Protein backbone atom coordinates (compact mmCIF):
# COMPACT_ATOMS: atom_id res chain seq x y z
CA UNK A 1 0.00 0.00 0.00
CA UNK A 2 2.78 2.38 -1.04
CA UNK A 3 0.53 4.38 -3.39
CA UNK A 4 -1.58 5.79 -0.54
CA UNK A 5 1.68 6.49 1.34
CA UNK A 6 3.24 8.52 -1.48
CA UNK A 7 -0.10 10.17 -2.28
CA UNK A 8 -0.35 11.39 1.32
CA UNK A 9 3.27 12.55 0.99
CA UNK A 10 2.40 14.59 -2.12
CA UNK A 11 -0.60 16.07 -0.30
CA UNK A 12 1.26 16.89 2.92
CA UNK A 13 4.35 18.33 1.25
CA UNK A 14 2.82 20.95 -1.07
CA UNK A 15 -0.96 21.33 -0.81
CA UNK A 16 -2.93 24.11 0.80
CA UNK A 17 -3.60 23.36 4.49
CA UNK A 18 -7.40 23.37 4.08
CA UNK A 19 -7.23 20.45 1.64
CA UNK A 20 -4.90 18.77 4.14
CA UNK A 21 -7.51 19.48 6.82
CA UNK A 22 -10.46 18.05 4.89
CA UNK A 23 -8.23 15.13 3.85
CA UNK A 24 -7.09 14.19 7.37
CA UNK A 25 -10.36 14.86 9.23
CA UNK A 26 -13.24 12.48 9.92
CA UNK A 27 -15.62 14.48 12.11
CA UNK A 28 -15.66 19.32 10.15
CA UNK A 29 -13.20 18.74 13.00
CA UNK A 30 -9.97 16.94 13.82
CA UNK A 31 -8.91 14.99 16.83
CA UNK A 32 -5.28 15.53 17.87
CA UNK A 33 -4.57 12.07 16.45
CA UNK A 34 -6.01 13.29 13.14
CA UNK A 35 -3.50 16.14 13.44
CA UNK A 36 -0.66 13.68 14.13
CA UNK A 37 -1.63 11.66 11.04
CA UNK A 38 -1.74 14.93 9.11
CA UNK A 39 1.80 15.87 10.19
CA UNK A 40 3.43 12.42 9.94
CA UNK A 41 3.76 10.28 6.73
CA UNK A 42 0.79 13.30 26.87
CA UNK A 43 -0.69 16.53 25.54
CA UNK A 44 -3.52 14.70 23.72
CA UNK A 45 -5.60 14.67 26.91
CA UNK A 46 -5.00 18.41 27.27
CA UNK A 47 -5.90 19.33 23.68
CA UNK A 48 -9.38 17.86 24.09
CA UNK A 49 -12.03 17.58 21.41
CA UNK A 50 -12.91 21.23 20.75
CA UNK A 51 -10.06 21.74 18.31
CA UNK A 52 -9.46 22.78 14.68
CA UNK A 53 -12.93 24.12 13.97
CA UNK A 54 -12.14 25.91 10.69
CA UNK A 55 -8.55 24.64 10.06
CA UNK A 56 -7.13 27.69 11.85
CA UNK A 57 -5.90 25.92 14.95
CA UNK A 58 -4.01 23.83 12.38
CA UNK A 59 -2.29 27.00 11.11
CA UNK A 60 -1.54 28.16 14.65
CA UNK A 61 0.00 24.90 15.83
CA UNK A 62 1.91 24.76 12.54
CA UNK A 63 3.24 28.20 13.45
CA UNK A 64 4.15 26.92 16.93
CA UNK A 65 6.05 24.08 15.27
CA UNK A 66 7.76 26.45 12.82
CA UNK A 67 8.86 29.62 14.63
CA UNK A 68 12.32 30.59 15.93
CA UNK A 69 12.61 32.22 19.32
CA UNK A 70 12.91 35.90 18.42
CA UNK A 71 10.14 35.34 15.87
CA UNK A 72 8.20 33.67 18.69
CA UNK A 73 8.63 36.69 20.96
CA UNK A 74 7.56 39.13 18.26
CA UNK A 75 4.57 36.88 17.59
CA UNK A 76 3.75 37.41 21.26
CA UNK A 77 4.24 41.13 20.55
CA UNK A 78 1.74 41.04 17.70
CA UNK A 79 -0.78 39.17 19.84
CA UNK A 80 -0.94 41.82 22.56
CA UNK A 81 -3.15 44.71 21.44
CA UNK A 82 -2.75 47.15 24.34
CA UNK A 83 0.79 45.93 25.03
CA UNK A 84 0.39 45.10 28.72
CA UNK A 85 2.56 42.00 28.37
CA UNK A 86 -0.42 39.68 28.92
CA UNK A 87 -2.62 37.92 26.39
CA UNK A 88 -5.83 36.43 27.71
CA UNK A 89 -7.97 34.11 25.63
CA UNK A 90 -10.22 37.10 24.87
CA UNK A 91 -7.46 38.94 22.97
CA UNK A 92 -6.63 35.67 21.23
CA UNK A 93 -10.29 35.36 20.19
CA UNK A 94 -10.14 38.91 18.84
CA UNK A 95 -7.03 38.04 16.82
CA UNK A 96 -8.50 34.65 15.88
CA UNK A 97 -11.64 36.05 14.26
CA UNK A 98 -9.35 38.12 12.02
CA UNK A 99 -7.30 34.97 11.34
CA UNK A 100 -10.36 32.97 10.28
CA UNK A 101 -11.97 35.85 8.37
CA UNK A 102 -11.58 26.06 22.37
CA UNK A 103 -10.31 23.38 24.73
CA UNK A 104 -6.73 24.64 24.45
CA UNK A 105 -7.98 28.20 24.94
CA UNK A 106 -9.57 27.10 28.21
CA UNK A 107 -6.52 24.97 29.05
CA UNK A 108 -3.59 27.33 28.51
CA UNK A 109 -5.12 30.77 29.17
CA UNK A 110 -7.63 30.17 31.95
CA UNK A 111 -10.25 27.61 32.95
CA UNK A 112 -12.56 30.39 34.16
CA UNK A 113 -12.04 32.39 30.91
CA UNK A 114 -9.27 34.40 32.62
CA UNK A 115 -5.88 34.62 30.94
CA UNK A 116 -2.92 36.18 32.76
CA UNK A 117 -0.16 35.02 30.45
CA UNK A 118 3.54 35.83 30.71
CA UNK A 119 6.17 35.30 28.02
CA UNK A 120 7.48 32.31 29.98
CA UNK A 121 4.23 30.32 29.81
CA UNK A 122 4.12 30.84 26.04
CA UNK A 123 7.75 29.65 25.85
CA UNK A 124 6.87 26.58 27.93
CA UNK A 125 3.95 25.90 25.59
CA UNK A 126 6.27 25.94 22.57
CA UNK A 127 8.88 23.78 24.28
CA UNK A 128 6.38 21.17 25.49
CA UNK A 129 4.61 20.95 22.13
CA UNK A 130 7.74 20.82 19.97
CA UNK A 131 9.55 18.47 22.35
CA UNK A 132 6.58 16.09 22.38
CA UNK A 133 6.55 16.15 18.56
CA UNK A 134 10.31 15.56 18.46
CA UNK A 135 9.99 12.70 20.96
CA UNK A 136 7.23 11.14 18.84
CA UNK A 137 9.48 11.39 15.78
CA UNK A 138 12.40 9.90 17.73
CA UNK A 139 10.24 7.01 18.93
CA UNK A 140 8.47 6.24 15.65
CA UNK A 141 11.74 4.72 14.40
CA UNK A 142 12.08 2.45 17.50
CA UNK A 143 15.46 3.49 18.96
CA UNK A 144 17.87 0.77 20.07
CA UNK A 145 17.76 1.79 23.75
CA UNK A 146 17.41 5.45 22.87
CA UNK A 147 19.79 5.10 19.91
CA UNK A 148 18.36 5.22 16.40
CA UNK A 149 20.29 4.01 13.39
CA UNK A 150 22.01 6.11 10.75
CA UNK A 151 19.43 5.52 8.02
CA UNK A 152 16.66 6.38 10.49
CA UNK A 153 18.27 9.72 11.32
CA UNK A 154 18.94 10.35 7.64
CA UNK A 155 15.28 9.63 6.93
CA UNK A 156 14.31 12.11 9.65
CA UNK A 157 16.56 14.74 8.07
CA UNK A 158 15.17 14.08 4.60
CA UNK A 159 11.61 14.19 5.94
CA UNK A 160 12.44 17.55 7.51
CA UNK A 161 14.07 18.85 4.32
CA UNK A 162 11.00 18.01 2.24
CA UNK A 163 12.87 17.93 -1.09
CA UNK A 164 12.40 14.79 -3.21
CA UNK A 165 16.08 14.11 -3.81
CA UNK A 166 17.13 10.73 -5.13
CA UNK A 167 20.86 11.45 -5.00
CA UNK A 168 20.50 12.02 -1.27
CA UNK A 169 18.22 8.97 -1.07
CA UNK A 170 20.99 6.86 -2.61
CA UNK A 171 23.42 8.42 -0.13
CA UNK A 172 20.99 7.56 2.69
CA UNK A 173 20.84 3.91 1.69
CA UNK A 174 24.62 3.96 1.31
CA UNK A 175 25.14 5.44 4.83
CA UNK A 176 25.07 2.02 6.49
CA UNK A 177 27.86 0.97 4.13
CA UNK A 178 29.78 4.24 4.56
CA UNK A 179 29.88 4.06 8.35
CA UNK A 180 30.27 0.31 8.62
CA UNK A 181 29.68 0.54 12.38
CA UNK A 182 27.02 2.73 13.92
CA UNK A 183 26.86 3.25 17.67
CA UNK A 184 23.49 4.99 17.41
CA UNK A 185 22.10 8.49 17.83
CA UNK A 186 20.95 9.49 21.30
CA UNK A 187 17.84 11.58 21.91
CA UNK A 188 19.95 14.45 23.21
CA UNK A 189 21.95 14.53 19.95
CA UNK A 190 18.69 14.63 17.99
CA UNK A 191 17.31 17.26 20.39
CA UNK A 192 20.35 19.55 20.10
CA UNK A 193 20.64 19.11 16.35
CA UNK A 194 17.01 19.83 15.49
CA UNK A 195 17.24 22.73 17.94
CA UNK A 196 20.05 23.94 15.69
CA UNK A 197 17.99 23.26 12.57
CA UNK A 198 15.08 25.26 13.99
CA UNK A 199 17.04 28.51 13.88
CA UNK A 200 18.91 28.41 10.55
CA UNK A 201 17.68 31.87 9.44
CA UNK A 202 19.43 33.24 12.50
CA UNK A 203 22.35 30.88 11.81
CA UNK A 204 22.38 32.16 8.20
CA UNK A 205 23.94 35.48 9.31
CA UNK A 206 27.52 34.40 9.98
CA UNK A 207 27.09 31.68 7.36
CA UNK A 208 26.51 34.24 4.61
CA UNK A 209 29.32 36.30 6.16
CA UNK A 210 31.51 33.27 5.61
CA UNK A 211 29.83 32.25 2.39
CA UNK A 212 29.96 35.26 0.08
CA UNK A 213 33.67 34.95 0.66
CA UNK A 214 33.72 31.16 0.40
CA UNK A 215 31.61 28.01 0.61
CA UNK A 216 33.77 25.72 2.74
CA UNK A 217 31.85 24.45 5.76
CA UNK A 218 33.66 22.52 8.49
CA UNK A 219 32.14 21.18 11.68
CA UNK A 220 33.92 23.30 14.28
CA UNK A 221 32.33 26.45 12.83
CA UNK A 222 28.88 24.85 12.92
CA UNK A 223 29.43 23.70 16.50
CA UNK A 224 30.54 27.19 17.54
CA UNK A 225 27.48 28.78 15.94
CA UNK A 226 25.22 26.06 17.41
CA UNK A 227 26.59 26.63 20.91
CA UNK A 228 26.39 30.37 20.18
CA UNK A 229 22.79 30.84 19.02
CA UNK A 230 21.15 27.79 20.62
CA UNK A 231 23.60 26.83 23.42
CA UNK A 232 23.50 23.27 22.06
CA UNK A 233 26.30 20.74 21.73
CA UNK A 234 26.70 18.92 18.43
CA UNK A 235 28.65 15.70 18.87
CA UNK A 236 31.17 15.00 16.14
CA UNK A 237 29.40 11.76 15.24
CA UNK A 238 26.41 13.85 14.15
CA UNK A 239 28.80 16.00 12.13
CA UNK A 240 30.24 12.85 10.54
CA UNK A 241 26.71 11.73 9.62
CA UNK A 242 25.86 15.12 8.11
CA UNK A 243 29.11 15.32 6.14
CA UNK A 244 28.73 11.73 4.92
CA UNK A 245 25.10 12.31 3.94
CA UNK A 246 25.07 15.74 2.33
CA UNK A 247 28.52 16.26 0.77
CA UNK A 248 27.47 15.19 -2.71
CA UNK A 249 30.63 16.15 -4.60
CA UNK A 250 32.67 14.74 -1.72
CA UNK A 251 35.09 17.65 -1.41
CA UNK A 252 35.06 17.36 2.39
CA UNK A 253 33.11 20.53 3.19
CA UNK A 254 29.64 21.81 2.40
CA UNK A 255 28.45 24.75 0.33
CA UNK A 256 25.24 26.74 0.74
CA UNK A 257 23.27 25.03 -2.03
CA UNK A 258 24.21 21.57 -0.76
CA UNK A 259 22.67 21.94 2.70
CA UNK A 260 21.94 25.40 4.03
CA UNK A 261 20.09 26.93 1.08
CA UNK A 262 17.79 23.91 0.93
CA UNK A 263 17.11 24.02 4.67
CA UNK A 264 16.47 27.77 4.45
CA UNK A 265 14.09 27.24 1.53
CA UNK A 266 12.27 24.67 3.66
CA UNK A 267 12.05 27.28 6.41
CA UNK A 268 10.53 29.67 3.89
CA UNK A 269 7.87 27.24 2.70
Amino acid sequence: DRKVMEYENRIRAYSTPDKIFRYFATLVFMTPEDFVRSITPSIFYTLGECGLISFSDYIFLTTVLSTPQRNFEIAFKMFDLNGDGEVDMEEFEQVQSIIRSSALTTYFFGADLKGKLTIKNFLEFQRKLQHDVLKLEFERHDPVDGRITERQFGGMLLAYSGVQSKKLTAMQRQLKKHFKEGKGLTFQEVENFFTFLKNINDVDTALSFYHMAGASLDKVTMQQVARTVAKVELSDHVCDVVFALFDCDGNGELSNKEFVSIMKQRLMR
Binding site: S165, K166, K167, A170, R173
Partner: protein
Protein backbone atom coordinates in the same frame (compact mmCIF):
# COMPACT_ATOMS: atom_id res chain seq x y z
CA UNK B 1 27.66 -21.04 -69.11
CA UNK B 2 29.18 -19.63 -65.92
CA UNK B 3 28.39 -16.22 -64.32
CA UNK B 4 31.02 -13.44 -64.25
CA UNK B 5 33.24 -12.70 -61.28
CA UNK B 6 31.50 -11.84 -58.00
CA UNK B 7 32.52 -8.21 -57.65
CA UNK B 8 34.33 -6.98 -54.54
CA UNK B 9 34.89 -3.45 -53.29
CA UNK B 10 37.85 -1.13 -52.65
CA UNK B 11 39.36 -2.73 -49.52
CA UNK B 12 36.09 -3.50 -47.80
CA UNK B 13 37.51 -5.12 -44.66
CA UNK B 14 39.77 -2.16 -43.91
CA UNK B 15 37.09 0.50 -44.41
CA UNK B 16 34.49 -1.50 -42.47
CA UNK B 17 36.95 -1.75 -39.57
CA UNK B 18 38.00 1.91 -39.92
CA UNK B 19 34.37 3.02 -39.68
CA UNK B 20 33.19 0.58 -37.01
CA UNK B 21 35.99 1.22 -34.48
CA UNK B 22 36.07 5.08 -34.19
CA UNK B 23 32.29 5.27 -34.01
CA UNK B 24 32.49 2.63 -31.28
CA UNK B 25 34.80 5.03 -29.45
CA UNK B 26 32.40 7.93 -30.07
CA UNK B 27 29.62 5.75 -28.69
CA UNK B 28 31.43 4.89 -25.47
CA UNK B 29 32.46 8.56 -25.12
CA UNK B 30 28.91 9.88 -25.44
CA UNK B 31 27.68 7.11 -23.15
CA UNK B 32 30.09 8.27 -20.44
CA UNK B 33 29.10 11.88 -21.16
CA UNK B 34 25.37 11.14 -20.84
CA UNK B 35 26.02 9.13 -17.67
CA UNK B 36 27.82 12.10 -16.11
CA UNK B 37 25.25 14.57 -17.47
CA UNK B 38 22.35 12.93 -15.71
CA UNK B 39 24.49 11.88 -12.78
CA UNK B 40 24.77 15.63 -12.17
CA UNK B 41 21.00 15.90 -11.92
CA UNK B 42 18.94 13.33 -10.01
CA UNK B 43 17.80 11.30 -13.03
CA UNK B 44 20.52 8.56 -12.90
CA UNK B 45 20.11 5.12 -11.38
CA UNK B 46 23.25 3.40 -10.16
CA UNK B 47 22.83 2.03 -6.65
Amino acid sequence: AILPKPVKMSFGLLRVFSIVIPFLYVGTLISKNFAALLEEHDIFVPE
